[PDB]
């Protein structure tokens, strides 16, 4: 009656450059099942999140460089109430961090033109109660399940010069709203801490 479910936005995107968020968070309306995050420069929001138009004083020569290659970037599409798919429209690779992709430890490098599924709401939901049960592990541990991280161009992980995503010249952190909505529900059921 007074609200829920159905989120206004189906996700939020926060661009980064090393350990600093650059530009402001991009909110994608649920009415926009597919969003494109490219290195171009159209400021107008809508379906495109252009990283090429974000300024940063700290920015270096190494990053101006990498940013140059984001290109057509990727796309994030919402299929089932809370299921997210990725499609690398870039000439360069993309490094995704996904738990669903682990069930199937990451740096799941996505290849140009690839169209992969990166998140399963149900699997997420399940896995939450999974943590709430054993507790009956805090909100910052479990909110991770509702999050996706994705580095453009460079990579990290246990096999590159860069150990953590906070080292890539440019990346993004995606929060899936529905997954968080289910998480707000689960949280109310983990009796006092």
């Amino acid at each position: 009656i007074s609200n829920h479910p159905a989120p206004e936005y189906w996700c939020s995107i926060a661009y980064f450059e090393m350990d600093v968020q650059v530009g402001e968070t991009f909110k994608v309306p649920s009415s926009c099942p597919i969003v494109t995050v490219d290195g171009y420069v159209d400021p107008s929001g809508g379906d495109r999140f252009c990283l090429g138009q974000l300024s940063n004083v700290h920015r270096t020569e190494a990053i101006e460089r990498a940013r140059l290659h984001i290109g057509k970037g990727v796309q994030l599409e919402c299929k089932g109430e809370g299921d997210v798919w990725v499609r690398c429209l870039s000439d360069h690779a993309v490094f995704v961090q996904s738990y669903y992709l682990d069930r199937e430890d990451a740096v799941h490098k996505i290849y140009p033109s690839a169209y992969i599924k990166v998140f399963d709401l149900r699997q997420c939901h399940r896995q939450m109660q999974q943590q709430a049960a054993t507790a009956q592990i805090g909100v910052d541990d479990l909110r991770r399940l509702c999050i996706l991280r994705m580095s453009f161009v460079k990579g990290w992980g246990p096999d590159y010069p860069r150990q953590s995503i906070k080292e890539t010249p440019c990346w993004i952190e995606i929060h899936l709203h529905r997954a968080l909505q289910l998480l707000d529900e689960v949280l109310h059921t983990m009796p006092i801490a």
């Binding site: 350990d19 909110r143 509702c146 929060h175 968080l180 909505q181 949280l187 801490a193």
Partner: protein, 196 residues
């Protein structure tokens, strides 16, 4: 309208986007609902450079604090199971202690954190003091709150920037009245150079 916006901080770092309150009664908690005009949920706000302490304290924010606009007065009710400290210059000056006074609000309690008429009257008599005296009233339109940990005298966290989880409130009504007076206070006397 928005009557107030709220900015969340973790130490001396600003975390998350500024929440704008459209509802006369809302809550700032540690949960994760993203689309609630009556719930500023801090749980869903990330911080890539977040420490264990911060992470640990976030867990005890629980139902957080409930802020609410009855008539021309603002109240803070501690829903969390841990206390919440409030530094309200408008609240302190009402019981006297050195504006910087942080006032603990134990679980299940609630305090009147701001009063309009009071402010308005403090704004009136300030016009007589001059520009500078009015410029500084912006502090009176701000209220700071820490969750779980306290600060100031009595705790060896002397500044808000020291606490792990706090939030600042800007009262738009008071700020708008202040703005109307300020655009009429003239200018500073004390000059300022372009090179120094």
């Amino acid at each position: 309208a928005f009557w107030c916006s709220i900015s969340y901080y973790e130490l001396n770092q600003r975390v998350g986007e500024t929440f704008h309150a459209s509802q006369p009664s809302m809550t700032v908690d540690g949960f994760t609902d993203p689309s609630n005009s009556e719930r500023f949920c801090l749980g869903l706000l990330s911080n890539v450079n977040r420490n264990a302490a911060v992470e640990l304290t976030r867990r005890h924010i629980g139902r957080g604090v409930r802020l609410y606009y009855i008539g021309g007065e603002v109240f803070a009710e501690c829903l969390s199971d841990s206390a919440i400290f409030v530094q309200s210059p408008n609240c302190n000056q009402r019981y006297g202690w050195h504006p910087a006074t942080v006032c603990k609000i134990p679980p299940g309690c609630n305090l009147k954190i701001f009063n309009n008429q009071e402010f308005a009257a403090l704004l009136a008599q300030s016009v007589n003091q001059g520009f500078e005296a009015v410029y500084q009233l912006t502090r009176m339109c701000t209220i700071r709150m820490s969750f779980v940990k306290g600060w100031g005298a009595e705790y060896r966290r002397q500044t808000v920037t020291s606490t792990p989880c706090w939030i600042e409130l800007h009262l738009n009504g008071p700020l708008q009245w202040l703005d109307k007076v300020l655009t009429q206070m003239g200018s500073p006397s004390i000059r300022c150079s372009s090179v120094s």
